[PDB]
Amino acid sequence: GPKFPRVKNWELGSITYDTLCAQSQQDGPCTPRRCLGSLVLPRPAEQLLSQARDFINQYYSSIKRSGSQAHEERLQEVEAEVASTGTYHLRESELVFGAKQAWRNAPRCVGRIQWGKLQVFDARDCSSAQEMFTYICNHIKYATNRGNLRSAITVFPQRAPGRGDFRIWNSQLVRYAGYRQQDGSVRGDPANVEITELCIQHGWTPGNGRFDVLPLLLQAPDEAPELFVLPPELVLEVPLEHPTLEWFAALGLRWYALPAVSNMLLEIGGLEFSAAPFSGWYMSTEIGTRNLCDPHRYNILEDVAVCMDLDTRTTSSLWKDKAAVEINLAVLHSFQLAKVTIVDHHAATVSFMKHLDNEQKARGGCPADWAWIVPPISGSLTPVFHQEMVNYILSPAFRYQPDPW
Amino acid sequence: KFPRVKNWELGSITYDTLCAQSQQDGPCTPRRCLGSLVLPRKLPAEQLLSQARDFINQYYSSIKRSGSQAHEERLQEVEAEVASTGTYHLRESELVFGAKQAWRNAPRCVGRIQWGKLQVFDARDCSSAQEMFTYICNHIKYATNRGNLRSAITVFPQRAPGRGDFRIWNSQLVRYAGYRQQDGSVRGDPANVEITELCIQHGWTPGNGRFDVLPLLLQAPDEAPELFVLPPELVLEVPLEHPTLEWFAALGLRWYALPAVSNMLLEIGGLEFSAAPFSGWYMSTEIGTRNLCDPHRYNILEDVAVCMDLDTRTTSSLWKDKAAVEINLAVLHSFQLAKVTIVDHHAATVSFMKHLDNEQKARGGCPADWAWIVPPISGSLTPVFHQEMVNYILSPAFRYQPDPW
Ligand code: HEM
Ligand code: HEM
Ligand SMILES: Fc1cccc(CCCNCCc2ccnc(-n3ccnc3)n2)c1
Numbered sequence: 001g002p003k004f005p006r007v008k009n010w011e012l013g014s015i016t017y018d019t020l021c022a023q024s025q026q027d028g029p030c031t032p033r034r035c036l037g038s039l040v041l042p043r044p045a046e047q048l049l050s051q052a053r054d055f056i057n058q059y060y061s062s063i064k065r066s067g068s069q070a071h072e073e074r075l076q077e078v079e080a081e082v083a084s085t086g087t088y089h090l091r092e093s094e095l096v097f098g099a100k101q102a103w104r105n106a107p108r109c110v111g112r113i114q115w116g117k118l119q120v121f122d123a124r125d126c127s128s129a130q131e132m133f134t135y136i137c138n139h140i141k142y143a144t145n146r147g148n149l150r151s152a153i154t155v156f157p158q159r160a161p162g163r164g165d166f167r168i169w170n171s172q173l174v175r176y177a178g179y180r181q182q183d184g185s186v187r188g189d190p191a192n193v194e195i196t197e198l199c200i201q202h203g204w205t206p207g208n209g210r211f212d213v214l215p216l217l218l219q220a221p222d223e224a225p226e227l228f229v230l231p232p233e234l235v236l237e238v239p240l241e242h243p244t245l246e247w248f249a250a251l252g253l254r255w256y257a258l259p260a261v262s263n264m265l266l267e268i269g270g271l272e273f274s275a276a277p278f279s280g281w282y283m284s285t286e287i288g289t290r291n292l293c294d295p296h297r298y299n300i301l302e303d304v305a306v307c308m309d310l311d312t313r314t315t316s317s318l319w320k321d322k323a324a325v326e327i328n329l330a331v332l333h334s335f336q337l338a339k340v341t342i343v344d345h346h347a348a349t350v351s352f353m354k355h356l357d358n359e360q361k362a363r364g365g366c367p368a369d370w371a372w373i374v375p376p377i378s379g380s381l382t383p384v385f386h387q388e389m390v391n392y393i394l395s396p397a398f399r400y401q402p403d404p405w
Numbered sequence: 406k407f408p409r410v411k412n413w414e415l416g417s418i419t420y421d422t423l424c425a426q427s428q429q430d431g432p433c434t435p436r437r438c439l440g441s442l443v444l445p446r447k448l449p450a451e452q453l454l455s456q457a458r459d460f461i462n463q464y465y466s467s468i469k470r471s472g473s474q475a476h477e478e479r480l481q482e483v484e485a486e487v488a489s490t491g492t493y494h495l496r497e498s499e500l501v502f503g504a505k506q507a508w509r510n511a512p513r514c515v516g517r518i519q520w521g522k523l524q525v526f527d528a529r530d531c532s533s534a535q536e537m538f539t540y541i542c543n544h545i546k547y548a549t550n551r552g553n554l555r556s557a558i559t560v561f562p563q564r565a566p567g568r569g570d571f572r573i574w575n576s577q578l579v580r581y582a583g584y585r586q587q588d589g590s591v592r593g594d595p596a597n598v599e600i601t602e603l604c605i606q607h608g609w610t611p612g613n614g615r616f617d618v619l620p621l622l623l624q625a626p627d628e629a630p631e632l633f634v635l636p637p638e639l640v641l642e643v644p645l646e647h648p649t650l651e652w653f654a655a656l657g658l659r660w661y662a663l664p665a666v667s668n669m670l671l672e673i674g675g676l677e678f679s680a681a682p683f684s685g686w687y688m689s690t691e692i693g694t695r696n697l698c699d700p701h702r703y704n705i706l707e708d709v710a711v712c713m714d715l716d717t718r719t720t721s722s723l724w725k726d727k728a729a730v731e732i733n734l735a736v737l738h739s740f741q742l743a744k745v746t747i748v749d750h751h752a753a754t755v756s757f758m759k760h761l762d763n764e765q766k767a768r769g770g771c772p773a774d775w776a777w778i779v780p781p782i783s784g785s786l787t788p789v790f791h792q793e794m795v796n797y798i799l800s801p802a803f804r805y806q807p808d809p810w
């Protein structure tokens with residue numbers, strides 16, 4: 001056989017070899033001695049030029065003008081630009097290409113079948129926090145599109161030598177408040193206690209509900225962040241009801257439509273875009289299993305099981321399994337009823353296999369994080385469970401970055 | 406620089422420093438992570454000697470005698486025997502220690518809380534297929550124990566540089582036949598088509614049901630394997646019914662009580678035992694989810710869905726998830742009613758968490774394969790989902806080896 005990692009599908013018996021991974025410049029957490037793939041937190045002078053060069057080569061290949069005059073001049077242009085300023089800038093269409101390619105490269109995203117259809121908003125002219133808010137609102141309105149959801153990213157100015165970053169402080173554009181109680185419990189989402197307390201320390205008047213939408217804390221270079229409240233009619237939400245358990249609607253559960261990640265760094269050709277929120281549409285277990293059922297999130301499993309009258313006294317009743325199923329169904333059903341785009345874990349992983357097969361033909365491999373791609377309920381029921389995956393970092397990339405506080 | 410292992414539900418952090426004792430490489434390297442592969446790709450005398458000394462050291466340490474007369478004299482014994490013969494032999498109590506330690510070290514086993522309670526049968530004085538059979542029968546009898554199962558291992562004679570290995574050709578001691586139909590399909594268990602064909606060809610008379618227990622092919626060194634039918638009365642089986650779905654028993658489903666792995670190689674102190682079958686008791690998802698719902702196994706999810714009257718025509722009705730849940734319920738109910746030891750995936754993973762904790766205290770870590778430990782349904786509903794894990798190879802170890810045909 002060839003000298004590349006052999007990849008196997010155990011449902012179908014079919015083999016592939018990943019040859020893409022040879023183009024991995026940046027290393028991962030693993031050595032020949034121990035496997036750190038399950039761990040969730042994955043722990044320039046001439047160094048910029050070589051990343052830039054390599055990026056410009058990717059751009060040129062993808063437009064098939066590799067080795068052209070236009071290619072060799074762009075490289076010279078980037079040399080010279082780095083030469084006199086320490087940095088360089090991307091052509092509009094270089095940024096569009098880099099953004100889709102960052103998405104294409106993201107090992108943990110299961111929606112990558114869609115990678116080619118990404119609206120890139122170019123917001124590198126933005127010069128204030130107020131202006132970031134407008135751009136974000138535009139993003140929300142465009143991506144939400146009354147429930148007919150549309151992938152999009154907005155790119156604010158790149159990190160710049162010595163001058164401070166644009167940062168959105170919130171981890172998503174839509175997030176519910178988490179209020180620490182005297183009894184030590186939390187009202188709302190325990191995931192958001194810190195950013196809740198920061199919004200208050202920064203003058204937000206806090207509600208006290210279970211599903212208060214957070215204000216955005218936005219930060220322009222070298223300035224304190226500023227608070228912006230989203231006008232409620234921009235933030236589309238779905239009340240959760242269950243197609244047959246009539247009492248589930250009485251639980252007053254809801255979820256927002258737009259999943260928009262706002263604290264990741266987009267790295268292109270060595271340039272770093274510290275503020276570059278992106279959004280897709282939800283895969284249903286992100287809501288019905290993680291957000292509503294994690295013990296450290298809303299944790300509603302016992303409540304739903306009690307209403308369903310299950311024996312919550314014994315693990316072997318499978319009461320957790322039954323409640324989780326019904327919560328996922330409710331989420332699916334309610335987004336359907338509301339006409340808000342959503343995808344179940346079956347449809348999603350099926351499309352993601354199609355994705356793998358496309359990338360196998362197009363680039364000879366596809367970096368994929370098995371733990372993240374396999375859904376949190378019904379694992380071996382989906383085809384990705386039976387698919388081996390190779391995980392590696394390719395650039396352009398979306399990367400985590402330290403919280404700005 | 407050591408592995409920092411974090412729990413994402415409780416927020417607590419440990420350090421694995423046990424992996425420092427890993428001598429053998431896993432499928433991973435800096436540039437690409439390979440940990441979701443089922444088979445990692447590979448499937449003088451001082452080498453053997455340092456493995457021996459090392460194991461001998463582990464043993465004496467275990468019994469708190471590390472520097473005794475007994476210790477130094479055992480090391481010279483080992484040394485003298487290797488120098489003169491290129492090999493050596495284990496004392497029965499070292500074997501007992503080695504086998505428990507191989508189980509303890511198995512990264513994929515969720516049952517390791519039990520590791521200290523392992524009945525070890527020394528069958529190293531075996532010399533023919535017939536002797537193998539007798540010992541295998543006593544194993545089954547002992548381990549089965551009328552349904553109150555007990556962990557056991559029987560160890561046949563070690564590989565010898567000279568000659569062919571003792572092998573059990575079956576991958577499990579109890580396995581159902583899979584008969585290929587001239588029209589594509591398989592009657593019985595599709596995972597066993599090959600071993601079913603080999604049995605017929607070495608002259609067994611095949612049945613034609615969905616649940617025909619296979620004979621064993623046992624092979625003494627350099628001989629054609631021989632066929633031994635297990636006497637029905639040793640093979641305890643549990644017919645499947647559901648606590649409330651009355652039609653479910655009509656499905657004529659059943660499964661065997663004894664889960665016994667017979668194709669793995671046991672490596673102690675550099676010695677290799679190519680026939681060393683072991684058994685515990687099932688975790689229910691192995692049967693309810695994988696064996697009966699894998700598409701390429703009994704694949705019964707649609708039949709059940711249709712009896713439950715579900716909307717089969719759409720993924721988003723979650724028909725697969727519902728059916729799977731009841732099928733797993735049926736398995737637990739049925740083993741409980743037959744009074745046959747079983748553990749559901751919630752109890753099992755809770756006890757594996759306790760295990761990691763004991764192991765942290767006792768050894769500074771525990772090798773674990775996240776993708777194997779996390780069950781095939783209801784992942785994030787179990788605490789192991791939320792727990793980071795470090796996979797690495799310690800010896801003594803259970804290993805895969807080539808099929809002997
Ligand atoms: C189009 C619909 C999309 C679906 C269904 C989807 C699905 C997912 C899911 C389920 C995850 C893992 C979330 C988690 O458990 O934390 C994920 C991660 C990710 N997605 Fe998407 N995604 C979509 C669109 C996008 C877009 C438009 C981008 C960027 C342009 C993107 C980039 C990412 C990245 C970077 C991650 C990993 C984030 C992390 O490590 O926390 N996705 N995706
Ligand atoms: C006491 C009850 C036990 C339970 C509940 C249990 C549970 C499990 C489970 C769920 C797996 C993964 C199985 C699969 O998906 O193929 C596994 C694998 C394994 N178990 Fe156990 N186990 C038990 C006893 C034992 C014993 C007695 C040994 C050996 C002495 C053992 C050694 C292993 C090994 C070596 C593997 C890896 C098998 C492979 O790679 O295919 N287990 N165990
Ligand atoms: F504290 C932490 C450290 C590292 C990862 C973590 C997981 C949260 C981030 N996962 C992204 C979740 C998320 C939310 C909304 N939308 C998306 N999204 C949008 C498009 N594709 C994915 N993804 C926590």
Ligand SMILES: Fc1cccc(CCCNCCc2ccnc(-n3ccnc3)n2)c1
Pocket residue numbers: 443444514516577664665666683684685686805
């Ligand atoms: F192609 C392959 C080659 C080797 C292993 C594979 C995985 C399946 C076998 N894993 C063990 C299954 C199994 C069955 C019964 N019992 C146990 N068992 C008993 C105690 N602990 C686990 N384990 C595929």
Ligand SMILES: C[C@H](O)[C@H](O)[C@H]1CNc2nc(N)[nH]c(=O)c2N1
Pocket residue numbers: 038039040371372373413790791792793794
């Ligand atoms: C320890 C483990 O890596 C952690 O729970 C992971 C598992 N798989 C995941 N998968 C997705 N999609 N998202 C996550 O946050 C996680 N968390």
Ligand SMILES: C[C@H](O)[C@H](O)[C@H]1CNc2nc(N)[nH]c(=O)c2N1
Pocket residue numbers: 010385386387388389441442443776777778
């Ligand atoms: C490709 C993937 O690693 C493969 O499906 C694994 C995943 N996890 C598993 N986990 C267990 N316990 N048993 C298995 O057979 C598998 N199969």
Ligand SMILES: [Zn+2]
Pocket residue numbers: 030034035036037433437438439440
């Ligand atoms: Zn790895």
